[PDB]
Design a protein around this motif. Structure first.
Motif, PDB file in Angstrom:
ATOM      1  N   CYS A  17      48.098  19.981  34.777  1.00 15.22           N
ATOM      2  CA  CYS A  17      49.290  20.483  35.471  1.00 15.22           C
ATOM      3  C   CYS A  17      49.364  19.886  36.868  1.00 15.22           C
ATOM      4  O   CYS A  17      48.338  19.783  37.552  1.00 15.22           O
ATOM      5  N   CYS A  20      48.403  22.820  39.618  1.00 13.33           N
ATOM      6  CA  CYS A  20      47.152  23.600  39.519  1.00 13.33           C
ATOM      7  C   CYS A  20      46.083  23.018  38.586  1.00 13.33           C
ATOM      8  O   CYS A  20      45.035  23.623  38.421  1.00 13.33           O
ATOM      9  N   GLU A  22      45.831  22.873  35.466  1.00 18.39           N
ATOM     10  CA  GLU A  22      45.714  23.511  34.166  1.00 18.39           C
ATOM     11  C   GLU A  22      45.859  22.414  33.102  1.00 18.39           C
ATOM     12  O   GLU A  22      46.773  21.598  33.172  1.00 18.39           O
ATOM     13  N   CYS A  37      52.280  23.557  33.701  1.00 13.20           N
ATOM     14  CA  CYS A  37      51.822  24.570  32.794  1.00 13.20           C
ATOM     15  C   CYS A  37      52.846  25.694  32.756  1.00 13.20           C
ATOM     16  O   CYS A  37      53.860  25.654  33.477  1.00 13.20           O
ATOM     17  N   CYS A  40      53.029  27.539  36.356  1.00 14.09           N
ATOM     18  CA  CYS A  40      53.715  26.770  37.392  1.00 14.09           C
ATOM     19  C   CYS A  40      55.180  26.423  37.073  1.00 14.09           C
ATOM     20  O   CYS A  40      56.005  26.359  37.998  1.00 14.09           O
ATOM     21  N   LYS A 103      49.423  30.238  43.576  1.00  8.10           N
ATOM     22  CA  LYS A 103      50.224  29.127  43.050  1.00  8.10           C
ATOM     23  C   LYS A 103      51.649  29.105  43.648  1.00  8.10           C
ATOM     24  O   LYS A 103      52.127  28.029  44.019  1.00  8.10           O
TER      25      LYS A 103
END
Ligand SMILES: [Zn+2]
Length: 250
Positions: A17, A20, A22, A37, A40, A103
């Protein structure tokens, strides 16, 4: 259609991601050119279309130009821009396990506040204009836009041309698509009343003409010589574009 999620995720750093890291993000922002993701992308939806246009890699349809556009950008490229000063600021990016709030704060600082940008992408608009022309540099266009470049920048004192008109003169489907995703007015004309459709048809760029028609180009707009795009198509003896324009009128 050819597995979009496989192709888009196979690009440099697109399997983490953007915001973040991910793994296996299945969402995307199509004006930014990044994968996201679930968490987000949901936050991106908060920002509004001016900042981010969220799409599913697996559940939505994708125009081939748009897939290719995603493949010339990507998380690594976009983070080089939007997270440029993170290391120097000694600040810490969220990881996959972080709070929604954490986030949220990062995404807002990154894209709205533009907090991690370098100072310079001195003239973002002119840079965008230059980078949209042959041969276009999509990373440079992205950098200029992040630094506040007007997507409809007018090349004043000169020809009053726009980045879209430059991308048209470059025969660049990708740069045109990029500018349009980022709010370019498909109808904005130069000093001689020639909009992007006029330029596509002057230059015999059938693909670009078709792109502009799909995005609401004014069929009937007349330039400073009283020509609409159909007249230019006839005068250049271009059967394909005449056909397009005539079909678009129907
Ligand atoms: Zn994420």
């Amino acid at each position: 259609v050819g597995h979009v999620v496989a192709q888009v995720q196979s690009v440099d750093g697109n399997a983490q991601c953007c915001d973040c890291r991910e793994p296996a993000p299945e969402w995307a922002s199509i004006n930014l050119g990044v994968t996201l993701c679930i968490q987000c992308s949901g936050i991106h939806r908060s920002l509004g279309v001016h900042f981010s246009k969220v799409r599913s890699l697996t559940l939505d349809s994708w125009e081939p130009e748009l897939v290719k556009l995603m493949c010339e950008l990507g998380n690594v490229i976009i983070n080089q821009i939007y997270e440029a000063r993170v290391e120097a600021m000694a600040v810490k990016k969220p990881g996959p396990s972080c709070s929604r709030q954490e986030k949220e704060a990062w995404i807002h600082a990154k894209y709205v506040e533009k907090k991690f940008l370098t100072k310079l992408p001195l003239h973002p608009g002119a840079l965008l204009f230059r980078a949209s022309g042959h041969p276009p540099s999509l990373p440079t266009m992205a950098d200029a836009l992040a630094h506040g470049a007007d997507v409809n920048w007018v090349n004043g004192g000169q020809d009053n041309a726009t980045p879209l008109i430059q991308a048209t003169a470059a025969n660049s489907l990708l740069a045109c698509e990029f500018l349009l995703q980022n709010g370019a007015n498909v109808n904005q004309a130069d000093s001689a009343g020639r909009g992007p459709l006029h330029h596509a048809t002057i230059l015999g760029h059938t693909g670009l003409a078709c792109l502009f028609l799909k995005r609401g180009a004014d069929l009937g707009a007349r330039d400073s010589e009283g020509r609409d795009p159909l007249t230019i198509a006839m005068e250049t003896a271009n059967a394909d574009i005449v056909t397009l324009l005539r079909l678009a009128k129907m």
